[PDB]
Structure formats: C-alpha cells, structure tokens
Subunit: 257 residues, 4 copies
C-alpha cells in the first residue's frame, strides 16, 4: 500500500471490532501501526498476523500507560503521524434513574478523558510531523439515543472537543477530525444484543435502523479513517458520518392529542 | 393580548391548518393580522370570526397579488411588523422517476419563490419598523424524506435562504428566522393520508414517528411564531424545530452484509 | 403574569448573569422561583427584590446540597414544574497543553454532572407535574471555540445529554430542551475580558462576533426559557440558539497553499 | 490507479476549477471519465491531456443535452457507475433588493434542476451498476452568506435533495452523497475577486476565513469525491465538508444594546 506509506499510526482499542478494522486499513495503506489495547487477546494476535502492526498493552484511562505508549512509539519508529482515539465502551441500556454519577464519571474517563490524554501527549510529535488526530465518536452523540444518557453525553463531548482542538491546532497544521459511526457489526454490538430477551430480534432491528438495510463493517470505518489521515488535507473539525443513513428521514420513535 | 400589541402581521396561507393557527396566535397576542390565502373559504370565515384579523385574497405565486397585498396592508393599517411565509404545498408521495422538472419548478414557485417575493416587497416596511420575517420550512428539509424529492428540496432552500437573508438584514435590525414543523395534524395531513391504502394506519404511523407519541397542533406552531416575532430579539437565522422529537434517535428506516 | 402561573421553577446559578435573567423572566410570567446558587450575595438580594422568588444556597456539585434543594422546594411549594440547569463556568482561555485532566474533570463536575444530578433528583416530581427540563448549554458546544477544549467538551455533552434524556422522558410527558447562548453580556463575560491585555478591544470583538452587532442580554435568554417551559409543548430535545447569528456565514478565523 | 478501476464516471462542469480537479482525481484512480461542460475550451484540452477522459459538450440546463450525455456515455463505455453534479454558478454579490425572481429562477435551473435532471436520467444505469451520486453543494447552503440569497437557497436545496434521494435510492443500493466545499481557489473565485475594489484584499480575506489559513484546492475536493465513490460504501445522504474549518468558532460577522 502506498497512500500512507512511511507514516506511523496509533489506534487505541485496536484489538477488535472497529479499532481492528482501522488497524487493518492503515496497514493496507502502507503505514506502520501501533495497536493499543487494554486486553491482550485480540491485539497480540493482530500483531502476529499483520507485518507492520505491533501491539502495546495500554489502558488509556491510565496516564502512565499512555505516556509509555507515546514514548515507546517514538523510540521504536522515530515519528508519529496519526492518532486514532477509538477506545471506548457502550454500557448495557440503562434508564436514567438507573444511572449513577459515579458510573457516568467512569464512562467519561474512558470515552472522553482517555481520548484527551493521548491526544495531549501526542500533539508535540504530531506538530513535528504535521500529523492529524481522528476521534471515533458516535452518531448518537448528535441525535441522542434512549437508555444511554451517559454514553450519549460522552460522545457529544468527543465531537465538540474535536472542533475545539481543530481550532487550537490549525495554526500548527495539525488537523483534528472525528468519525461518527452508527450501527457497526462488532463484538460489542453482539454482546449487547445477547443481553436482550430476543437477541435475533434486536439484531434485526439494528439492521433495519438504516435505509441501507444492514449494519456497517469495521473495514468501512477503517476506510473513512485512512481517508481523513491521508487525503482530507483541507478537512479539520469535521464529523464524518458512517451510518448507512440512519439519521435521515422519519422512523418509528414512540391524533394531535 | 399584550405581547405583540400595536403590531401588524401578514400570514400567508392563513386560511386553514398551520397558517390559521399562526393567525389565531397573533390575534391572541394583540396584533392586527392580515390573512393572505389563495382560497376564500377558510380565510373569509376567519376574518368574520376574529376581531383584528382581515382577509386579503392573494396567490403568493402571482407577483401583482403580492404587491397589492403589501400596499393594501400599509394603506389599511399604517405599518408592517412581521411577515409569516406559511403558504406552501406537499404533493402526494412520488418516487423520483415519477417526478418531473416542470412539477419541481411549480413547487419551487409556491414553496420558495412565493416566500422570496413577499419578503422582498415587505422588507422596506420591515426595515422602518425593525420588524421580522418568519419562514415556515419543514423538518424534512433538514433530514430528508422518502418519495418527496421536490418538496424536500424546496424546504432545504427555504431554511438556507432564511440564514442568507438574516445576514443581509442584520445591519438594519430586521431578524429573519424559520420554523421547521414535523408532523402537524392539519387538513393537508388528513387529505394526504386519505390517498393511502389504509388512511388510519398512515395516521397511526405519523403519530408514532415522534417520541411524544402524537402529532403537533397548529396552535403550537403559532406559539412558536409569536415567540420569534415578539420575544426572540437576539435570534436571527435560527431554525426552530417544532417536531415532537422526530429527529432524535434511531427508528425503523428500511448483519453487516 | 399569567403564562406560567401556579408553576414552580428551580434555576441553578440564578444569583447573577444569565441565571438571574431567567429568574426574573419566570417571576414575570407568574411562576414561583427557587433561586439556587453557591454564592449568597446575588441570590439573597434577588429573593428580597422579587416577590415569588426565594433563595436556597446550593452547590450543584454537592449531591447532598442538591437533594436538599429538591426536598426543600417540594416541602415549601408542593410541586416542581421546571428545572433550569444554568449553573456553569467558563475558565479563562487555555491552550490545550495548558489544560489538565484534573481541571477537565472539575469542569465536568460543574457544567455536566451538576446538571445530571439535579435533573435526576427532580424527574420523579417533574413526571408527576408533566414538567420540563431546560439545560443552558453554549453555542461553542456546537461550533467549537479556541483555547477552551474542556469547556467546549462539557457543553457538547450537555447538548447531547439533552437529546438522550428527551428520548427517555418522552413516554412520561416530560420535555427536555436546551438553550445555546452565544455572547451574552454578563459578569462572567466582563471578568473574562478584564484578564485580557485590552479588555475594551476584547469586548468590542465580542460584540462584532454576531451579525446583530451586539451581545445578548440575560433577559433574552430568560424569554427563551419561559417559551420552552410554558409554550413549546411539542418541542423536546431541541437546541434553541440565542446567539445573534454568530454561527451564520464566514468570518475571520485565522492562496490555496 | 486501482481504487476505482473499471468504473465509468460523469463529471459535470468538469472543464475547469473544482470539476477539473474531480476529473483528474477519478482518472488517477483508474476510472474512465466523461467530462461534461457547456464551454469547450477547458474540457477539450483536458480530454487531450488525460488518457481515459473524454469531453462531451453538454449544457445541463438543456434536457436534450443531458439525455444525449447519458446515452452517449452508455454507448461509448457500456456502463455508468458515478455521476458528479458539479456544474453550478455563483453570481457576483447582490443585496436582496438587487435580486430578481427571474434571476433566482435561472440560478435554480443551473444549480438545482440541472443536478436533478442528470441524476434522474442516470439512475436506471446507476441502479444496474449499484453506482452512486455525488452532488457538489456549498458550505454556505448550511451556514448562509451575505449578498447571495439565490445562491445560498440553491445550495440548501441541493444538500436537502441529496438526503431525500438517498432515502429513495437506498433500497436499490444506490448511494447519494454531497460535498460542501468552502473557499476553494478556482477561476470562479478569481473572477469574483477581480470585480471587487481591492481584489488582493478580497483574496486575503478569503484565505483567512478558515482556521487553516488558506483556501482549498480542486484536487482536495477531488480526493473527497473519489472517497465517496470508491470507499464510502456505508455512507449515504451525508454532507462531506471540505472547508478548512470555516464553519468552526466565532469570527467577525458584523455592549448588549
Ligand atoms: N459498534 C457500533 O455500532 C458503534 C457505534 C458508534 C460508535 N462506536 C464507537 O466505536 C468505538 C469502538 O467500538 P466497538 O464496537 O469496536 O467496540 P468493541 O468492544 O468491539 O472494541 C473496543 C476495543 O477497545 C478496547 N478498550 C476498551 N477500553 C479500553 C481502555 N481503557 N484502554 C484501551 N483499550 C480499551 C477493548 O478492549 C476492545 O478491544 C467505541 O469508541 C464506540 O463507542 C461503535
Ligand atoms: N402539516 C405538516 O405536518 C407540515 C410539516 C412540515 C411543514 N409544513 C408546512 O407548513 C405550511 C402549512 O401547511 P399545512 O399543513 O397547514 O397545509 P394546508 O394545506 O392545511 O394549508 C395551507 C394553506 O395555504 C394556502 N395556500 C396554498 N397555496 C397558496 C398560494 N399560492 N397562495 C396563497 N395561499 C396558498 C392553502 O389554500 C391553505 O389555506 C406549508 O408551508 C407546509 O409545507 C407542514
Ligand atoms: N455569558 C455567555 O456569553 C455565555 C455563553 C454561552 C453559554 N453560557 C452559559 O450560561 C450559564 C451562565 O453563565 P453566565 O454568563 O451567567 O455566568 P456567571 O458567572 O455571570 O453566573 C453563573 C452563576 O452560577 C453560579 N454558580 C457557579 N458554580 C455554581 C455551583 N457549583 N453551584 C451553584 N451555582 C453555581 C455562580 O455563582 C453565578 O451566580 C453557564 O452555564 C455558561 O456556560 C454563557
Ligand atoms: N470555488 C468555491 O469556493 C466553491 C465553494 C462552494 C461551492 N462551490 C461549487 O463548486 C462547483 C464548481 O465551482 P468552481 O469554483 O469550480 O467554478 P468554475 O466557474 O471555476 O467552474 C464551473 C464549471 O462548470 C461549467 N458550467 C457552468 N454552467 C454549466 C452548464 N449549464 N452546463 C455545464 N457546465 C456548466 C463552467 O463552464 C465551468 O467549467 C459549483 O457547483 C460551485 O457552486 C465552489
Ligand atoms: C442497542 C444495541 C447496541 C447499540 C450500540 C452499540 C455500540 C455503540 O458504541 C453504540 C450503540 C448505539 C445504539 C445501541 C442500540 C440501541 C438499541 C439496542 O439494542
Ligand atoms: C406522508 C403524509 C404527509 C406528511 C407531510 C405532510 C405535510 C407536509 O408539509 C410535510 C409532510 C412530510 C411527511 C409526510 C408523510 C411521509 C409519509 C406519509 O404518509
Ligand atoms: C472569550 C470571552 C468569554 C467568552 C465566553 C464567556 C462565557 C461563556 O460561557 C462562553 C464564552 C465563549 C466565548 C468566550 C470568548 C472567546 C474569546 C474571548 O475573549
Ligand atoms: C465572495 C467571493 C466568492 C466566494 C464564493 C465563490 C464560489 C462559490 O461557489 C461560493 C462562494 C461563497 C463565498 C464567496 C465570497 C463571499 C465574499 C466574497 O468576496
Ligand atoms: Na506485526
Ligand atoms: Na375580523
Ligand atoms: Na422574594
Ligand atoms: Na483523453
């Protein structure tokens, strides 16, 4: 691959799901990729599978993990061109009264402050390389979702933070963009559906939530990330929707009384 | 009513439906209201019913009708403070290949150029009064809709035009805003449902398209218009959604293949 | 005042600035208002000034403060119809590398989790009254701002949270909306400008950031809040911009190389 | 080039500016490209320059031109995979009272109905190929612009139409997306600046309107188009901003009175 050759990319949560799709896409483009993940299973196997990907164990909520991730990346590959903040979690559905402030704070630690912390530690190197930041947010940050107040709020914050940082880093040539996926078929989606009374019905509903009639693939989020890194040189602060059109038109969400 | 007392308001398409709800709201606020409509039936009765509303027959697609509407309004009431461009039409559902360029042009004449023409003729008087313009657009201009390519396009244009005009008229103190209703229960909604194989099913689906579980009322669009005219003095170029939350969250719009 | 008569409203941060403008607007509408604030000076004086407003000392970041705020409101007035989450802070400008994770967390405590906590404690009473929630967010949550990564992120979260909660509470008839002000002339604005090398220049730039050529008033945010509470009965999950058109058109933000 | 090899692309207005950048990008990707333009000068030279691009004279406002364009494309290349509706015009700046209904209609003919007409004639072939439609809209359709009411309205319509058509064509696998460029340095930009009292000042202002401090290049819009055609397989109805961040943050657009 040639479109991002000679570049060094860090993908957090890259061991499975969307993150692994982004890893594969960047390897396919000719980049060297550092797979960051808190769990060893998927990321270790991915390093063995892909020439040009290596795995570094790193919990993005642990600042010393993240510092070591950046310093190890520079020590081993000599530059850093792109950070993809994909690490994140969607808790099982919760009515608002079932949420807690402390659960909210914990989700903010992963989905929001983990992204903030790696970005901060990476920006000195991204400025040297005129690199770029790609945050993986969520369509539900923009349109809301039921039984997910903390999750929706963390993604609203990521999308907004992306624009604020794009403004701060534009004088240095560092672009900052986000991708907002809708329903992408991943192990997280499958686990969440399994908790439901009728998992197959839940999966069927998830497919029909978009006009294309299917969920998206990790590879399709990966292609969007490679575009933003390698070819979107006049794009900064944008929110790239990868949703199959879920946000378009009327649907079933529930005569004038 | 006191909140818009001494003000003179023109509402196009005010003979029935949303337009009549806006007329009643402005009368209730203390304004004098000119009901403009191409059909006599509803608007004539409304003039008889409401002290402080009068009916002027006017087809907004006919420039000489509109010129007479403005000059008659000034001749009879001495000022013009607010123009509500509500006149518009939603054709029966049409697949894209069933549309025509000439039908598209005709819908543009009513939904878009009629609004443009009255606004243009009224702005000299609105500048003298530091008045304001309220365009009735549609939620589907923002999110799209199936089988309505011309309609959606005309409303996308109205919402965009509202922002361009807000920019041009801001130095003169003239605010320009729009309201984007979703499903409002009106005679147009009822007629359109009647064409469907199961009208009651279509009406039931329309109610459940919003999380509030009902369609909106003309009076609720009317309250939003009075707010924009009388109290939104720092609002210009905004799109006020009156939709019951139809744009929020996932719905049925149609595993990763 | 009649438009919200017999209703009971809680406004956080109501001692000064936007919050005090919202308090006055709701009193003017006939509501009883509980002024919540962490500082005594402004809120105590406002209680003495306004018949029908009372002051309750409450730091919204302290859960026991908030519990007492809700229980005292119910004990004293017998119902709760509207909660306005206005309490919030905009730190002095900070480049991203000057921010800290712990400062970010602290700003999240005030701007985001304080709003979450009062909303949660109030919703059982809002469900009984078919009341509503109004969150005061910020235009910069939607469009970003330079040197304000934590602030922008907290407001992106508030706006997103508003839509998620609107979805959860719609089956109970509880509407949840937000207002996104732009530049409103308040003591916070004046303090922030005073830190600048040329405060008058900074204030002049703030006025010209919107096409209307002035900043907004607290009373204008207050009118928008009363509209959402009392008359926007088909509005839920909306973001009402009160910005003077700052988001419209091109401006100075910094030939094809 | 390999990423869109074996595909056949029609680009309207492809003789110069953004359109020519899109032509070059698709040729570079391995596609065969039909350059459609109303003027011969640029498009004829481009056909001679690029193996795999051919020029067909076609005014998109003339329905018989467009029918011949589609039938000639099929006759010569055997399939049609992507239509890029780029043809469009930005009139010199006009205050609203300087616009006319008939000038508005004429601009609608080019910017809106030309796009509608080619799309309609091409969709039977796009359905056979599971092809896609890319409309070139404008950032000012979304945020407005001063002294451009007709132009802004036509682009608001294109962006909205894109979502409506995405909904209609999703069951057939045909994606419909748009690109919204901001300031791209083109012959149209240069001509418009030349009309200004100080062209260099106008160009300088155009560069500083985005946080990246420069205008965009046609090649950068071209890269975004190739991404949408070849790799955005789960994107439909999206508006891809190619603006350098012009829509982000506050700027100069013109204390609380
Ligand atoms: N799947 C969807 O439909 C969907 C939709 C919108 C947004 N998203 C977002 O996409 C991203 C990826 O989601 P997914 O579906 O691939 O989920 P996933 O659970 O399948 O994979 C997430 C990966 O991140 C890792 N991770 C979690 N916490 C971490 C931590 N503290 N440090 C490092 N790595 C950590 C996990 O171990 C896992 O390998 C998330 O940010 C999610 O919010 C997903
Ligand atoms: N009803 C909804 O759910 C809905 C949703 C979104 C937007 N809207 C918009 O709201 C507006 C009003 O719609 P409605 O549901 O009340 O429709 P309606 O058919 O019930 O009423 C429209 C009124 O406008 C009049 N009118 C039509 N053409 C006219 C012309 N050329 N000149 C003057 N008057 C003319 C009609 O005679 C009628 O009195 C329209 O612009 C429509 O697009 C409606
Ligand atoms: N002023 C603007 O231009 C502007 C723009 C956009 C959004 N906003 C938002 O509007 C809201 C009000 O801002 P303002 O300009 O009136 O600011 P302000 O500083 O003038 O007033 C805020 C009030 O909230 C109180 N408060 C702060 N922390 C609190 C806590 N922990 N518990 C209880 N009360 C607390 C303060 O004591 C003060 O009385 C904030 O949420 C702010 O982010 C303001
Ligand atoms: N340049 C910018 O900053 C900018 C910004 C936003 C959007 N746009 C849009 O991008 C598109 C291209 O603009 P540009 O800057 O390259 O302009 P341009 O004037 O440099 O090129 C437009 C091309 O389209 C052709 N064309 C015009 N009318 C036609 C017709 N009837 N039939 C066929 N071809 C026709 C012209 O002959 C020319 O070759 C337009 O739709 C424009 O609105 C441009
Ligand atoms: C949930 C499954 C899991 C989805 C999911 C999964 C991962 C993610 O990062 C975001 C989302 C948002 C929507 C979620 C669904 C709503 C209804 C349902 O069954
Ligand atoms: C249509 C009924 C009529 C609706 C309507 C009615 C009037 C209007 O100005 C806009 C709309 C948009 C949605 C329309 C429905 C989509 C499906 C259906 O049955
Ligand atoms: C800041 C002043 C204070 C503004 C302010 C004040 C309060 C607030 O809640 C939000 C904002 C956002 C914009 C801020 C300005 C940007 C440049 C400047 O000088
Ligand atoms: C105009 C130059 C030409 C720009 C232009 C050029 C082409 C186009 O398709 C859109 C636009 C929108 C902005 C326009 C500028 C605003 C101020 C100015 O000088
Ligand atoms: Na490897
Ligand atoms: Na009367
Ligand atoms: Na009192
Ligand atoms: Na050639």
């Amino acid at each position: 691959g040639t479109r991002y050759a000679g570049k060094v990319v860090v993908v957090t949560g890259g061991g499975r799901g969307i993150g692994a799709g982004i890893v594969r896409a960047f390897v396919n483009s000719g980049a060297r990729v550092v797979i960051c993940d808190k769990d060893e299973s998927g990321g270790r196997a991915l390093e063995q599978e892909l020439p040009g990907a290596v795995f570094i164990l790193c919990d993005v909520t642990q600042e010393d993990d993240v510092k070591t991730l950046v310093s190890e990346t520079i020590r081993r590959f000599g530059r850093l061109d792109c950070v993809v903040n994909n690490a994140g979690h969607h808790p099982p559905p919760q009515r608002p009264e079932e949420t807690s402030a402390q659960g909210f704070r914990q989700l903010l630690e992963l989905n929001l402050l983990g992204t903030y912390t790696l970005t901060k530690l990476a920006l000195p190197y991204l400025r040297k390389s005129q690199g770029n930041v790609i945050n993986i947010s969520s369509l539900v940050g923009a349109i809301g979702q039921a039984q997910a107040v903390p999750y929706v709020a963390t993604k609203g914050a990521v999308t907004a933070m992306t624009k604020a940082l794009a403004l701060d880093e534009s004088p240095y040539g560092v672009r900052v963009n986000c991708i907002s996926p809708g329903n992408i078929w991943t192990p997280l989606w499958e686990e969440l559906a399994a908790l439901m009374p009728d998992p197959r019905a839940t999966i069927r509903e998830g497919m029909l939530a978009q006009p294309l009639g299917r969920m998206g693939q990790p590879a399709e989020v990966g292609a969007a990330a490679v575009f933003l890194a390698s070819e979107a040189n006049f794009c900064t602060g944008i929110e790239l929707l990868v949703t199959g059109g879920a946000e378009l038109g009327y649907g079933c969400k529930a005569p004038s009384g």
